[PDB]
Amino acid sequence: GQNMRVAFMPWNGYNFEDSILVSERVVQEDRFTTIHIQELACVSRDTKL
Amino acid sequence: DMGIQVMEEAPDADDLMNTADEDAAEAAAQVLSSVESEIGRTTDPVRM
Amino acid sequence: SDEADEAYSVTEQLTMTGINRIRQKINAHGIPVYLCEACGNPIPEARRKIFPGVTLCVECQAYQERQRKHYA
Amino acid sequence: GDDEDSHLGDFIEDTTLELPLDSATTESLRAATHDVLAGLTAREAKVLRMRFGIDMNTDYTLEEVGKQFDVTRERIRQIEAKALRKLRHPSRSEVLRSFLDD
Amino acid sequence: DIVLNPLGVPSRMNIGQILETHLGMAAKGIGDKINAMLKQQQEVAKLREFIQRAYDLGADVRQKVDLSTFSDEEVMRLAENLRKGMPIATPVFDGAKEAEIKELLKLGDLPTSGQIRLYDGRTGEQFERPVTVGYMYMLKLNHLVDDKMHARSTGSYSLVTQQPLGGKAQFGGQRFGEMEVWALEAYGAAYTLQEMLTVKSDDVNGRTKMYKNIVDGNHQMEPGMPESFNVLLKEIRSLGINIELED
Amino acid sequence: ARVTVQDAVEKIGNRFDLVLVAARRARQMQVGGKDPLVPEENDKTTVIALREIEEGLINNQILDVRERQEQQEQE
Amino acid sequence: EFDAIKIALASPDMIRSWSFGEVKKPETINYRTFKPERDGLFCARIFGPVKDYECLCGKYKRLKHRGVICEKCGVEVTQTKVRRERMGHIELASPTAHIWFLKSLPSRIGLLLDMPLRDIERVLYFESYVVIEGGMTNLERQQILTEEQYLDALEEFGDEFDAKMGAEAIQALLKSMDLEQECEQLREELNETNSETKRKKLTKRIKLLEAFVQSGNKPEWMILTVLPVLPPDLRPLVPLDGGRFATSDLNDLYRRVINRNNRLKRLLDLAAPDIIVRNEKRMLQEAVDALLDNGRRGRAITGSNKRPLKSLADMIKGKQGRFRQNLLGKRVDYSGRSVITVGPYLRLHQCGLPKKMALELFKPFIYGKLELRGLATTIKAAKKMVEREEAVVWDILDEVIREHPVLLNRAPTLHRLGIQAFEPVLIEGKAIQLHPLVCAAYNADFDGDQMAVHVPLTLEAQLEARALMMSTNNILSPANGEPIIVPSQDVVLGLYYMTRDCVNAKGEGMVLTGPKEAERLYRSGLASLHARVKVRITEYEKDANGELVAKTSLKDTTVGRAILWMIVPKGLPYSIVNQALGKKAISKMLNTCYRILGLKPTVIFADQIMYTGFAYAARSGASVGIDDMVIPEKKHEIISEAEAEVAEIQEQFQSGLVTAGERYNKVIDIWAAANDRVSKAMMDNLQTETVINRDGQEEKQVSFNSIYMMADSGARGSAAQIRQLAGMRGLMAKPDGSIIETPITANFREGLNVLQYFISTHGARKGLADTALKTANSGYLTRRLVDVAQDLVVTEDDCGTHEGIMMTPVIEGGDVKEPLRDRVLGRVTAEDVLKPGTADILVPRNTLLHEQWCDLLEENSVDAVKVRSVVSCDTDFGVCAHCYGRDLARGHIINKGEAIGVIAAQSIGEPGTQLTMRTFHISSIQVKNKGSIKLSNVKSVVNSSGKLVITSRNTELKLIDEFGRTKESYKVPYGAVLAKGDGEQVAGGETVANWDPHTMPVITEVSGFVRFTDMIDGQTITRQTDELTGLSSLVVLDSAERTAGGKDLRPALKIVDAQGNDVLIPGTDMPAQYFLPGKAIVQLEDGVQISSGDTLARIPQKDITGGLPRVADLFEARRPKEPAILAEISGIVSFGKETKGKRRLVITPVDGSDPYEEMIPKWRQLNVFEGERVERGDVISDGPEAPHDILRLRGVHAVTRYIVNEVQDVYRLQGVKINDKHIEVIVRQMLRKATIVNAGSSDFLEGEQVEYSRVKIANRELEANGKVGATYSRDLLGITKASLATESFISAASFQETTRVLTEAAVAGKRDELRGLKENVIVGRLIPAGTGYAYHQDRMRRRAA
Ligand SMILES: [Mg+2]
Ligand SMILES: [Zn+2]
Ligand SMILES: [Zn+2]
Ligand SMILES: [Zn+2]
Fold it and tell me: Tell me, what does this protein do in biology (chain A)?
């Protein structure tokens, strides 16, 4: 994970039930930007034609 | 087919859920009482 | 809610209605009986002092509980 | 062996159906072609329809068309070519050629 | 950096998060002191002194380390690794009890009670009732939304039961089940249900007619017959059973 | 944008007919060539039909009467 | 379009009409050029072509030939959609028994011929022979034979003797039989001769026979001659990738049948020895029988995959057939799912919707709009524009979105608020931001729960969503009118923190010109949010007729209350916000606003509550810290003293003064008490511990410990969880329910060590496991309950009846468990409510008892009202609106068309999720309230002691005060020595009844001579003498000890008078000789006259379950084998024969026929005196009373009151709130079969069971006619039995056994009329319930016209 400076307090219903109000520094600093490598295939078959 | 379902163990202990009604009950009891009167089989073409 | 939030209440009902029957087997009334209702032995003063309202000597109670333990 | 216990026969798409966008296109194509023919002389319009199968039964050879108008098939070829040349120009062909999305 | 709801603390009896928050604020306070000393560069002397104090700090610990056997450049690589914040171990049922957490929060100049007074970022007026702010370790579970979010307006259709298929992971229409059918039946929503069972899913002429109507600015519908039903007719009729629709 | 149909269910009576009347009325202004009776404020035909239903100038008998009269102008 | 659907047999003729040509060869395709091979299982010329408007020749590839059939290869140039509707027949070489009518149990060929299943199974597999018109010689028609006797009797006869075998024989039988012949013959020989099993089975048979005659069937169509084949596209042979085709088993099965059919044909051509052709016939029969229903009888043929391959039934029947999954629940277009987030900025009638989701679900809308506005020439150009996502595409999107509400739905749709509809606010993001207040309904939370958005296409759909399903239209729980919009956790805590008060805050004491000045101070910074203050508020009230009259004043409030006052609408008092506003107060605030200002101001006000709540909970800064979980300081003492207690008990155990189990019990007891004591210490330390001082010394106020605030505002938490944070976390239980003996004496603020944590693990994982199972079996109750009550609909405005039930306050054990204002609210009064002195007709007789009328009821102190019930309505096939009440989900009244059955099943299955899944358990009559006596069902005697001893049985005492309403309930036991009398004056402190449970009197009415009449000492008496008192007791023993000298004699203790003649008891011709039961403490022996009701003879000597399964059994209506035996008829009781176990008890009327015997098993202690003239519907055995008995004796209203009370108590012990209409409608759906007490003028068998509406319509038609109709006997079935018997077959075959229902409806020619809700969903037409009610009505009047 990443240890971030969290404050426990309600702050405006933006964490109503379980939600989590993340700040923009979390998204600028790229401390959750995570790389996913995906594999796409393309096969050439032998149609009857 | 008429009830009651033959599971292989103890359960139904605390499962209080009756789709086994009702004309099938006496007919299936008749068929069971008859199965002893015969010995089979009339169900495998190969053996017959 | 969630898994843990309902699991808490399931466990909590479990624990509460498990405490309560073990606590209801306890005698809270008062009626000294002095004679074990199965064998007539005199229930000693001390064993009537702990559980007031106990109507069996310790021997007959051990017997009856040993019998209970197999659901007979 | 998935969650629903759905079998194999439920993951086979139907590669023959036409997507509703495509049918809703060629309905629009029928609209556009009928519109374009409307802005044509009745001779050229009837020859264009009768030449292809546009909004009728069977398309016809040139000779049947000349039959319909008492002309040789060469007259009919002249009519068809003139109508086609007329339609090729935009202001009757902008939306039409846009149907050729490429 | 991240505002969490307090109300999920006492319901769910996980006080581990609050104590980890306190200890994390403590550790980042030690890291802050080390970083200000190592940024305003004093020397190895004061720096080694402060790290040595923050490294003893406890009850009968098992972690006696002494920066007397180090280099003076082997303390600088260390105390630079401790500038973002000085880690802290806490074996599972052998953790750091609250006495030590107060001690470490006092090592740095943080408030002992673990709570700060934040000010509001939008009005700038201080939140009364001082708040807990610390350093918590947030994971990022890979239930990522963009593998969750999908839509479908129209697409492929299954081959026997002419229903929406997708299959490209995933253009599948929603599994409008049976309990949803009852949710619509408890309403008077009879048209919503009817189009949700005939023109949206099965009826192979109703669905093209519906697409054409929508693109032509008319929201009517030709209900037709669900394909599941006439397949059912064909199968019941494939036994020795005759089942017709009388008029 | 209209939020509740309290006064609509009030005026028309039944609430399953507040649906049907409003739907046919809106259909007249989407399919047919009608003009909405109330001033439309970037409103959809559904909400417009509900708004007419709510003031009490469109409902079952009125729409039936207008269809009759229109077919009587068919002459 | 169409109407009812007819199912029936199909002749070979009809099958040959269905087809388009016969399938002769078993080959499918051509394996190199995969054209479907002629003319086999996939034949181009039989089952249509393979390409749209192209024949298989290749010669005809244009539409211009569309309709000509290529003379080269026969195919018909058409659409390959046609390859899905054609069928083909297979000419069977020998007949074949349709396995459905053969082995359905009961075998229809069996009991159409009255031939045993074994005999037909012999003739079918050729192990036997059967005669058919065996000439005029020796053998009856149905006579079985064998090889041997056959060849024998053939020597007798070559002709006039017809004994076939196999399906040919069964067919020649089925066709040779005459339905009218045997049916009228059974008529004759059942009329002139009647015997019980005889009339039973024979009238069953004649029912079947005349059913077959009434249908269009023919008796031999059960035996296939031509066999149909499914169309190819329904059993395709699709080419997968890699030349590896995929098919369905039906091709394999059809190959297997066609192969053996052809082989049989060739055998018949070759004239083979009949052994081989016999084996071939049997092989073909097994093939057809495995094609129809594989696995039915003979160990199903397994495919190549080892697997039992599916057949037509398995494509129909079972959990996987058509009727279940694709016929009820399908994947649907214009739909998406994603993750919901909070979005508090919203209103509660909108929902965020990502631009990606919105642009994708709404494609055709954008396409049409872009080509309407001219922004795109064609539709193709519009698709290109959108897939490029230009700047005007977004604006056109927001133009389209505007009033089109989208439906939001969640995964476990537990009730009807699981589907709502909102207006979409486009949201530049990827999560469906769902408004906060709605998560209560959806049961949603924001830890990953995905929601699914559906788009409604048509205009009727948008008007349904906006009028029937909008999220602003359902603010009331449909289970009960209480709103489902209650603010949950951030907002109740913010509102709570606002409306509170310190004892000395900033700005205290000052007086304010109004709420605006309150906010002007608070935001300025001059007053704390809770600093008490005098402010001038002007609150309105709607006292007059719609006149909101204002009244102003200087109220004593805080800054927070007055700041919150600006969001309250007009007609609400200031007292609503001058309290501390937990969750209950912040819920009843919304509730009162609904009851006063209607619905619009309540939705606006609820949004305002949410906004102000979030805002001030943010401003509060209310966090939680580890210093907030304050441990008490008297904790270590309490734990130490409990440890000393357990050490002393263990020491006593070591000294043999206690058992093991009792040491354990005492240990658990002292630990429970120490746990409670620590909980109390901590809560006392924590609730008031804010100790402040104003203008001086000190004063303790309620605490501000944020953990306490969240627990005391109802925001989150309770006593127990903080007990686990600060106090000790108690005794933890292992999963069997047996509690561990050592408790975790710690909290979570201090750690648990390894052992205590390992101990909490047990119960924790048990609870986790039982919620992971409780969820997967979630909608089993609701689903089981909508099967029974689906087709029920409010179908009339008023049925005009005066039946009903007597709603009453519930008072059980002690005081009230729920007022009458609840149980009467919004139900229609059946008959007039008069005042106490009755004074005038107060409440008219068709008044919707809304909140004004509930007030006007409690303002006259009524405690019984005759309210119309659903179960005692009169309309057939529905329910009139008035005899149901008011739709508590909408407030106003039920409408003609609400499918109240479905919403009842849902309103019982949803709160069934808040009930635990596993099942679940639990001296004198002293007055405690102020009131006055009233004894009910009283027949007592005032003995010589001046006291009272009641000789009745049902005598119990209720408390009636100055107003007259019932105050308290108590039971007056038999011989309960009453110090009072009856109805006189009483106060709390005078014990009304003292009675000893050791003794149950035989209380005399006369202070007369004892007399032992019919009391034989030694044969009817036991010579007891207690030498403690030295007590001469001629006790009577039971009939289990004494000899046959006085065996069935009766020991009679009687009070005669003081000269020697028998004192007759006043009223009948019997002196008061109380015949003695056994075991009696008859202390006084003869020659001692005593008081009027002494205990001459003295008889010697409330668990409640709570599971949801207790509810399932409460509805299934099982007869518990400990059932109280009521009295079949009022009148003089009497006993009879003894010592059988089944002992005789009979009751004789004054007037009717006496002799009714009943055999009471002597295991049960009898509870009625020998000669007490008993009431009707009494109790003799006591315990469980079977509901069937309650119906048959006390009536319908008594059984409905019983079942409603049972279910309501199971839901009330946990506090779940549910109305009564729901249990009543389900109970009405329970008792809907009746059987006749007299076959009467009608057309009904005596013991035949028909739907009660059928009886009640025919009898109304008859007593409107000349005769008088059936005398019915109402019956009661469980839900699982009533939902089996239903009218449709498309409906009741979806969820029942498919084969049995289909076969019965086939033999009986039962044409289903689509008038239910399961059918009209299957077929795909409008349901008759809601909006579709109007369409179904006007189409029902189109026809019949
Ligand atoms: Mg969740
Ligand atoms: Zn003993
Ligand atoms: Zn051809
Ligand atoms: Zn009625």
Answer: DNA-dependent RNA polymerase catalyzes the transcription of DNA into RNA using the four ribonucleoside triphosphates as substrates.
- Secondary structure in 3-state letters for G232-296: HHHCCCCECCCCCECCCHHHHHHHHHHHHHHHHHHHHHHCCCHHHHHHHHHHHHHHHHHHHCCCC
Per DSSP, helices labelled H in G1082-1130 are 1108-1116
Instruction: Nearest chain E residue to F30 by CA: give it.
Output: E218
Q: How far is CA G75 from CA G23, G35, G281, in A?
A: 15, 12, 34
Structure determination technique employed: cryo-EM
Cα distance between residue C49 and residue G47, in whole Å: 94
Q: Which residues of D define the annotated binding site?
A: 94, 97
3-state secondary structure of G811: strand
Q: Compute the distance between CA of residue G621 and CA of residue G624 in angstroms, rounded to an integer.
A: 10
Residue D15 neighbours by CB distance under 10 Å: 9
- Contact present, D and B (at least 3 Cβ pairs less than 8 Å): no
CA gap G548, G540 in Å, rounded: 6
How many domains does one find in chain C?
A: 1
Residue with tokens 């060869």, as numbered in its chain: G25
How far G694 CA lies from chain C's nearest CA (Å)? Answer: 42
Peptide bond into G39 cis (omega under 30): yes
Q: Give the best residue of F7, F11, F14, F15 to mutate against chain G (max G CB count within 10 A).
A: F15
Give the Cα separation of G997 and G771 in Å (integer).
Answer: 44
CB G104 within 8 A of CB G1300: yes
Q: What angle do CA E218, E221, E227 make, to 5 degrees?
A: 145
The annotation places the binding site of D for Mg(2+) at 94, 97
Distance CA A15, CA E226 (A): 44
CA distances from G1146 to G179, G694, G953, G1141, G1164 (A): 47, 82, 18, 16, 17
- Cβ G396 vs Cβ G370: under 8 Å: yes
Dist. CA G685–CA E131, nearest whole Å: 22
Domain extent for G1300: 1292-1342
Question: What is residue E96's DSSP assignment?
Answer: -
Determine the distance separating the centroid of ligand 2 and the alpha carbon of C55, expressed in angstroms.
9
CA G10 distance to own-chain centroid: 39
Find the helix or strand (DSSP H, E) in which E176 lies.
strand E174-176
Cβ contact, residue pair E190, G1327, below 8 Å: yes
Nearest to G1249, CA basis, from G1230, G1232, G1262: G1232
Q: Which two tokens stand for residue G760?
A: 């909490």
Can you name the residues that pair with G551 across neighbouring β-strands?
Answer: G539
Looking at G621-698, which runs of residues are DSSP E strands? 691-692
Q: Which two tokens stand for residue E106?
A: 């006092």
Domain of residue C69, residue span: 1-72
Q: How far apart are CA G831 and CA G818, in angstroms?
A: 23
| Region label for G1297, one of left (φ > 0), alpha (ψ between -120 and 50) or beta (otherwise) | beta
Closest alpha carbon to G1173 in G1067, G1304, G1276? G1067
CA G567 – CA G610 distance, rounded (Å): 11
| Cross-strand partners of G969 | G958
CA distance G345 to G435: 8
Phi, psi values for residue G1284, rounded to 5°: -75, -60
Write out the DSSP string of G1321-1343.
HHTT---SSSTHHHHHHHHHHHS
Q: What is the DSSP letter of G298?
A: S
Give the relative orientation of helices F16-30 and G1332-1342 as an angle to the nearest 10 degrees. Answer: 80
- Domains of chain F in start order, with CATH, are 1-75 (3.90.940.10)
| Radius of gyration of chain C measured on its C-alpha atoms | 18
Please tell me the total number of residues recorded for chain F in this structure: 75
Which tokens belong to G875? 């309309």
